[model samples]
Target: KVGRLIYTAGGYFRQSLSYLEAYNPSNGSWLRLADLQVPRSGLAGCVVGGLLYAVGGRNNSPDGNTDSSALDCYNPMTNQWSPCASMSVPRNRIGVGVIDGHIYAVGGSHGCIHHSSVERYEPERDEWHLVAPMLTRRIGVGVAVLNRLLYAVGGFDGTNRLNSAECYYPERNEWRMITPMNTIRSGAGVCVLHNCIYAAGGYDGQDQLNSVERYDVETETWTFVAPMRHHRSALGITVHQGKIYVLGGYDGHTFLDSVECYDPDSDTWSEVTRMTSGRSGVGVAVTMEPC
Candidate 1:
């Protein structure tokens, strides 16, 4: 493992709970972990207190991607998963993260409707608290937390792509709009490194994307970065060993098992070992490696 272990949720049509691990850079191999209690697609995950918190994916087709109110926590130590507190409402393709020890499940679609609503999950109390609504409604968005605020960016609003962005303030329990992205997209992978949030490889309706964009939280400016080697969308994005890794997604018509990564220091992108399974609309999180 890079420092902490990382894994992803995968499926053919995006309902598989199969988890794969990256124990370390050169020696790591993907081993199957515990399956989710239910099959889901469009899933997203985050890590808190060394545990993987998976939330808000759908159970069926593109049109019927159902939002799951259920939340599950996977303990790497035992390789066991247990149900956590449910969400206040059902939503799919949500942005999931933890800020100030609180987990935010933000901006998702339920059935055909996009949502601007936000909610908080507190592990200690096993409860949820409603927060502010976003300025715009979007699902299939990418989310990240930096400096105690949550950033929700770039997703679809059913009929069109969105480059719009927003931030959630934990103390005030409010959401404020930020600088919008240069490209309107959905199903992208997102991560934060060196104080900049990187958004990579998503769909723009007509085609999948290889374009990479970065937003500096401090300056509130967006920058264009090196693109992925291949176009991808509806996959997972995470940082390990100071590198941004993108794995398994769709290229509009086909699911892919190809994996690619980028190093911020080098300003370059490179291909990595492919996963055994091809999938889209899955979620990934880093976990502890097996000893």
Candidate 2:
């Protein structure tokens, strides 16, 4: 059996959900998976050392005030979940990345306040610790690791939607600003493919956007790319077999179940099978599991 691309917990309309599912490109199908321990939305998840880590997110209450510090790990091999050390602070809509052997949780919001704080998780030690903070305080940031460095892209900083981007250097334990995106976007989806990082549809405070952009690390600049078929924000994003996949999101008026694929070689976008449920703030990660 080939590996699967997974989508974790998220919110559908006003409700936080523990729904989990996976997409198999081989058969062009989706399979429902085990439910999360609890309902969560705006959470961060990534695969490290063959395990999927679900980090902090909110309960998706009517007021959207509840936040969580919970951390859980899923093992694809056994289809089981186990608890891990919680983060130092509870947050939602954060960015997460795997560097070396550790997972780094980036900026996000807690109730009304946006956080610039960053935290590092060592799985072996099962511990969470603070790391160098980003220069800008933000929520809804998109994170990806490319060439061994972590990058946090466009998000809302409470006062304004942002186009600014920055990178974290582990060697120096510091962060430096990078070229800004062409459009101010919050809740955008980001992933790495072919040495470049791609930012997908997001909201710009005023309207939901279908625009896309690519960051060339070597050039240290961002250039506009082909947009998705539908507008998306707070979506799930991942890369599989050299192609980029953008999943569920909110398109302002409607929660979206649509999925799309991008081809870097051809600079085009195409629709994939829609997900079973329309969602926002879902966690997505791609990994190859042994047959």
Candidate 3:
């Protein structure tokens, strides 16, 4: 982890997995990392304090449960996976964001109806606290931060696909609904770039989507941009080296190992080196290679 990298954790191919790997942007190379203790899919992950955290995804079992609110933290230096403080409730298809040293786990569903429950974790105390919830309950949501405000974007609400968006202001501990996206999306990969939020590929309850949209905070508008090379849902996406890396996800038929990179400057997307394995419902995060 001496160089900036992208990490993908537990996902589904034929079944849930505990596999994890890191992609080094410096050399376009892939490095295998420690795997999660519990096999999971439809999970969400984020990085804080130089450690990668994977949280709340259902496991492959006869019970088909979230496996008890498990959270795994990976240490690059040690290349080991260790359990961390668990969440209050189990969740799947969660949206994760980090701000003010807290990892915010947004809306996700474990069983039937999606949840509005929002929680934050403090790495210092190793505890999670319930915070203000979303206005609407959703699963497969996309969470990100801009101007220090947390945004939860498009997702499915059990019945229909959602295009609604909302922002959480920590100072007031409240969420305000903002402009909705142009298209409905679930399992979309969301990340912040160039002062704007980009929500990419996902399912619309109809079909997999390749569409990518950018939100301009100042103008409060979402405009369409170039679509991806392939339709993907439950994909892992993040920003690295001034480019957006969209990783493995389900393309409606099978799990994908293909990777795509987006340049905000050109508003274009191009192919990149693939991961060692293909997966969907994958959890993706980034950490600076500590110098």
Candidate 4:
């Protein structure tokens, strides 16, 4: 039967992982899918034109580990992965968002050296082109697309954890600053809900964060909301069936398998089914239908 699918891609366990699984939110069930050609962590995932794309992240190889600029595409129909064009620069802890059929790889770091540069991937050309960079360099930034605009949320900027955020307008090829988040955060789990941008659990300068907040586009304001049951960073967040599903992440002391769901209407978070394995730097994506 054709229905919705939420995909969790390559992420870190002890080493980078190649596991890919599809979650059926309708029943809170999961089905293992094909693994990536190369294992990676800190990648960002999104769907475009019915294909899921996994972009830049770090990979740990046998001889030597390396920060990555790799790109891989998966077709739901065949359940296989096909390598795609790589970004010019290696990056990990990246945030990716797809808009107007183009995938924007937002700020992330290359072995602790953070970046503010951005790039776009065009499927038609099978290529990547430089785009307008962000106002500030960020690693582990949270990215979400709302009202056709790409929002890059809080992250680390080398020496300091950031509380700032920015928005990108594709037509103008420019970025504009937005109201800062309530707290400095890195590895924030960001998503859009009810026309507002939500920034969930992340790492503050000193602690793994449980505090959550949202920026209402209508009011242009940031406000605190119900916190999570546990603090998490390097987490994955997405929207499914009108609720926010937060998946595996690191909680400072441990890799977490616990999952939680948030109801914007009730302004609360409730524990859900835990993943089979813990994923600290997971990539999450949701698409309505699959062939």
Candidate 5:
């Protein structure tokens, strides 16, 4: 039901769940959805089999001690929420992806300690199972499934932001190191299209980044793509109707409300309508539309 729409939550106290129809690049506009079940600041969403899964995040106020193992899935078709089996471990700022109908929840921080712990979600059993851990432990990373495997890319490692990358093979139940990025960055968004994994706008240790990098699984190397219009981090990226759309993020000093689009086939980037309110941490809805 939310096809080609980007759903994110990182705005101020009142505004939450920013949704945008990302196709027709010219037709881009945002609308406000219902407030989250909780007023969480850094939550993430993973759509499993057309169902939206809203996961862990922290409260906006200080002393934000949050590690929510609770996983709730939303059915846009029904406009309702159902509690799924809780995660094996409670963690926020984690990366999530679905592989062969199994939802894989990956790395995130747990207090001062970062997590390499990986878990798999079974919809039928409504349960979670601990799987192979990531080679590098970090938070604010991005995860994607491509060609029957899982890839986790750049994120802050606590001591420093990372440009490192890794892949998980579910069939083999193992992890392997892959090519690193040209620039050390984290918190950028990521998406898969046309057989390539694209990593866009993130922090480069010193400042927010507009840099876009694409990784080829066949070549096992990184290629730079067109930079985003705004230097952004903590934004959300998703594919709809064949084009890659980037949602809200912090430009540098202030959080952003702007949206941008990338045409992989054309190798061009274009600006789209901004959100009603500026937000950074976003939860992209899952859809089958071929953007």
Candidate 6:
């Protein structure tokens, strides 16, 4: 058996990091893991078949070349990292999700240009395939999987921040618009718990937001939840021990090292241990292992 919540590379003060960290909730312990082959930020990470995959993002290099198509896989069981097939297109601030053993890379920006293109990765074959694109191009989008369906939520569309949301059905290879969110948020943290989707604090074009919202799959609507204590955007989010954990992110004034958790049972938010350093664009995921 296996279980842990992992956070991968992200940016701090214009520099991309290669650091990898693991949080074990049972003991409230955090372990520093192996670094990535290439430093990156604004990437998306997901777990499939016990392997953790880090998809496209941008590096900190001052050179014009920054956005990457890199795909790296980490095997926690062996404490090793290896390269996998790169994404078909280089992008940053991408949204990633896994369903039925395949990883999907959704909307993001390529060289700062919003892209609606979607791609799927098959770990079994170590290959990528282009899939149906989204109706709107975006970056900093939030993605989550619920009831076997993949959803792409609000993000920046190059011209403006968005409130629109959509879902993809793999069976028919189609994308369909769903209810838009109440607030326009880009760089929000999204996760699924108890069969409901939660969208947490993000940038609303003017300031970092503390507001949070929940989505009902049955009704395809969104409702406000108890807001977080801190206002931040580009945060990392994951679920463990039946609660949603929102990690490091950025507020308009400073990079945030703060962390918080949301409880659906009581409809409340509380603070958690902060990370050693502030960061944004970090990749977060959870896995279960035998105690």
Cα lDDT tens digits, model 2, 175-235, are: 9999999899899998998878888988898888899999999998888888889998989
Candidate 6 contains a number of clashing pairs equal to: 7
* Ranking according to lDDT, highest score first: 4, 3, 2, 6, 1, 5
- C-alpha lDDT values of all predictions: 0.80, 0.86, 0.88, 0.89, 0.75, 0.85
| Candidate 6 lDDT, 200-232, residue by residue in tens | 999899999999998899988899999998899
Residue range 1-291, candidate 1, lDDT tens digits: 445665776444544444544434566566777777877777787888888888887787445545688788888788888999898888788888788777888888887878888888888998998888887888989998877778898898778888888888877877888998888779888878779888898887778898999999989999999988888988788888789888888887778887787988889998877776778877777766643
In candidate 2, list every pair of residues with a backbone clash.
Answer: none
Model 5 Cα shift for residue 109 (angstroms): 1.0
TM-score of each: 0.93, 0.96, 0.96, 0.96, 0.90, 0.95
For model 1 the local lDDT of residue 24 reads 48
- How well does candidate 1 score on lDDT at residue 50? 83
- Model 3: ten consecutive residues of lowest lDDT: 60-69
Writing each residue's lDDT as its tens digit, candidate 4 over 91-204 gives 899999888999999988887689999999999999999999999999999999998899999988888889999999999999999999879989989999888899999988
* Residue-wise C-alpha lDDT for candidate 3, range 1-291, written one tens digit per residue: 356788888888878888888788778878776778889988887898889999888896655565337677888777888888999998888889999779999888877858999999999999999999999998999999988999999998878889999999999999999999998998999999987999999988889999999899999999989999999999999988789999989898878989999987898899888877788888988875422
| Higher-lDDT candidate of 2 and 6 | 2
Q: What overall lDDT, based on C-alpha atoms, would model 2 receive against the true structure?
A: 0.86
- Candidate 6 lDDT for residue 141: 95
Q: C-alpha displacement of 199 in model 2, angstroms?
A: 1.0
Displacement of the residue 112 alpha carbon in candidate 3, Å: 1.3
